[model samples]
Target: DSFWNPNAFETDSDLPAGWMRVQDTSGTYYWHIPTGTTQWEPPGRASPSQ
Candidate 1:
């Protein structure tokens, strides 16, 4: 298991070893795990989109 959990509900930029970071386009100030990759998703996007 890596320090970065791309499946977490939320993850911070300053991560521990093995953790990867990404930026959000909406400017929500958070890393977003692309659809089908994680449980969380951008609200109001689509039902099966994720």
Candidate 2:
């Protein structure tokens, strides 16, 4: 399930099997199937809010 993001990926290389690429308004990122978490999350939304 390769979610193509033209301006999202730097190279899209070396992505392990079963991993997917994602590009949001913030920037480009990756999702690991095992953990189901985005590769990186910025400071503001790093964790849940109260």
Candidate 3:
């Protein structure tokens, strides 16, 4: 439902665009740069709430 990046690198190349694993100070959560959305579980739902 959205566009994606074609260029690939390594390791983090697993994710698309600005989408990747991020550990914010708020805690364990996921977010989207394109839509500026934020969540706690997705893609890899290893939610570690601390």
Candidate 4:
């Protein structure tokens, strides 16, 4: 089958680029650069009821 689609480019790096894991929301993780720093914060979210 002839499909009109293109292959995506790939890059090899030792670490993630321009992004970091900030926190987790409702068990979901999020990545972002905070305060223009490369440091990444641990996951955080409201705990479930006991």
Error of 4 at 4 (Å): 54
Count of backbone clashes, every candidate in sequence: 1, 0, 0, 0
Tens-digit lDDT track of model 3 for 1-50: 23544653334435556666676788756667878887665565455894
Q: For candidate 2, what's the RMSD?
A: 10.8
Candidate closest to the true structure, highest TM-score: 2
- The 0-to-1 C-alpha lDDT of every candidate, in the order given, reads 0.43, 0.62, 0.60, 0.42
Inter-residue clash pairs, candidate 2: none
List, residue by residue over 1-50, the lDDT tens digit for candidate 1: 46866866665535433334555564433233443232223333346955
- The predicted structure with the larger TM-score, 1 or 4, is 4
Clashing pairs in 4: none
Candidate 1 lDDT = 0.43
Q: Which stretches of candidate 3 lie over 4 Å from their true place?
A: 1-18, 44-50
Pairs with steric clashes in candidate 1:
4-19
Q: Candidate 3: give the clashing pairs.
A: none
Which scores greater on lDDT, model 1 or model 4? Answer: 1
Residue-wise C-alpha lDDT for candidate 4, range 6-42, written one tens digit per residue: 5333232223445544334444233445556433344
CA RMSD per model (angstroms): 11.6, 10.8, 11.1, 11.5
The worst-scoring run of ten residues by lDDT in candidate 4 lies at 7-16
State how far residue 48 of model 1 sits from its true place (Å): 40
Count backbone clashes in candidate 3.
0
